[PDB]
C-alpha cells in the first residue's frame, strides 16, 4: 500500500541508478504492474520512462 | 448573464421547492424594489441588505404557513430580453383572478396591478407571482 518514492521523499528517478530500477523489474526483464508494487501513478510513469531509457542503452535486459 | 430578474425568480422558486428558509443573492435597485414589494404583500417574511464592497447583497427569508404550507406557489416571467411586453392602463391583467399579484414598471416606478389600475397608468409587466 505504501508507495516507496513518496515515503522516502525522492523526487527524480535517474536512469543511471540501476539498483533502484532492478527492484521494479521482474525475473524476465518485465516492468512490474502498479497493483503489485504500490507505487504512485506519477512516480510509476516516471519510473517507466527511466527504465526504458536505461534499458535502451544496454544497461537493463530487454528479455530474460 | 442576459437576465438577472429571471435568475431572481428562479432562485426563489428553487428555494421554495426545497423548503429552504434563507436565500442570498447579489443586489441591485430593481431587485430591492421587487423584494420590498413581495414583503409588502407578505409573500416573504423579511429582507435584509448586506453591504459588501463589490455590489451589495440581499437576503430574503422564505415564509411558510401553518403545517408547512407554501405561501408562494409559483413565479412566471413575462417580459424577456428576446420579447419585451408593455401593457396599457386598461390592459393590465389580473393574476389568478385577483388571488395573485403582478409587478409592472410604469412611469411612477414599480407598482402592483392594484396600484397601476388605481392611477390609470401603464408600463411594462415584469412577472406574475401567486
Amino acid at each position: 500500500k505504501v508507495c516507496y518514492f513518496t515515503s522516502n521523499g525522492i523526487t527524480h528517478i535517474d536512469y543511471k541508478d540501476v539498483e533502484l530500477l532492478k527492484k521494479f523489474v521482474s525475473e524476465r526483464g518485465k516492468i512490474l504492474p502498479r497493483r503489485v508494487t504500490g507505487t504512485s501513478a506519477k512516480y510509476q510513469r516516471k519510473l517507466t520512462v527511466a527504465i526504458k531509457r536505461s534499458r535502451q542503452m544496454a544497461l537493463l535486459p530487454f528479455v530474460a | 448573464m442576459t437576465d438577472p430578474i429571471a435568475d431572481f425568480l428562479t432562485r426563489i422558486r428553487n428555494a421554495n421547492m426545497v423548503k429552504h428558509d434563507k436565500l442570498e443573492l447579489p443586489a441591485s435597485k430593481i431587485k430591492k424594489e421587487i423584494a420590498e414589494i413581495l414583503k409588502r404583500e407578505g409573500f416573504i417574511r423579511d429582507v435584509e441588505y448586506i453591504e459588501d464592497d463589490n455590489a451589495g447583497t440581499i437576503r430574503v427569508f422564505l415564509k411558510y404557513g401553518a403545517t408547512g404550507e407554501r405561501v408562494i406557489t409559483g413565479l412566471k416571467r413575462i417580459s424577456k430580453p428576446g420579447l419585451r411586453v408593455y401593457a396599457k392602463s386598461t390592459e393590465v391583467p389580473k393574476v389568478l383572478n385577483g388571488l395573485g399579484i403582478a409587478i409592472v414598471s410604469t412611469s411612477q416606478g414599480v407598482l402592483t396591478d392594484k396600484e397601476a389600475r388605481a392611477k390609470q397608468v401603464g408600463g411594462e409587466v415584469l412577472a406574475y407571482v401567486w
Binding site: 536512469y15 543511471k16 531509457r53 534499458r55 535502451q56 542503452m57 544496454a58 544497461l59 537493463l60 535486459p61 530487454f62 528479455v63 | -
Partner: protein, 93 residues
Amino acid sequence: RKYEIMYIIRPNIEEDEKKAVVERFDGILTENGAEIIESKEWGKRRLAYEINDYRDGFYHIVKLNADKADSINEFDRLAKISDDIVRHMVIKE
C-alpha cells in the same frame, strides 16, 4: 539548456586510442559552441544484451551547458560515423 551525453566505447580499444577518441569528441563537441562542465568515466561494464560483436564496454559521461543546440547535432553524426563509439544518447536535463 543543460544536456548529458553518455556513450560506450568498444572493449578492445587500448588506452591510447581510447583517450585519443575521448579528447577528439570533447573537442568536436566544444568547437561548435559549448561550455563543458564535467567529463567523468564510468569505465568497464558488462552489457545486459550484446551489440554487434561485443559483450563489454567502456562507459563515458559528459555534461554540457550549450545554448545553441547545434554542437550536439554535430556530435550525433560524428558519433554515427566513428566505429570506436558503439552507442550514444543525449538527454536534456
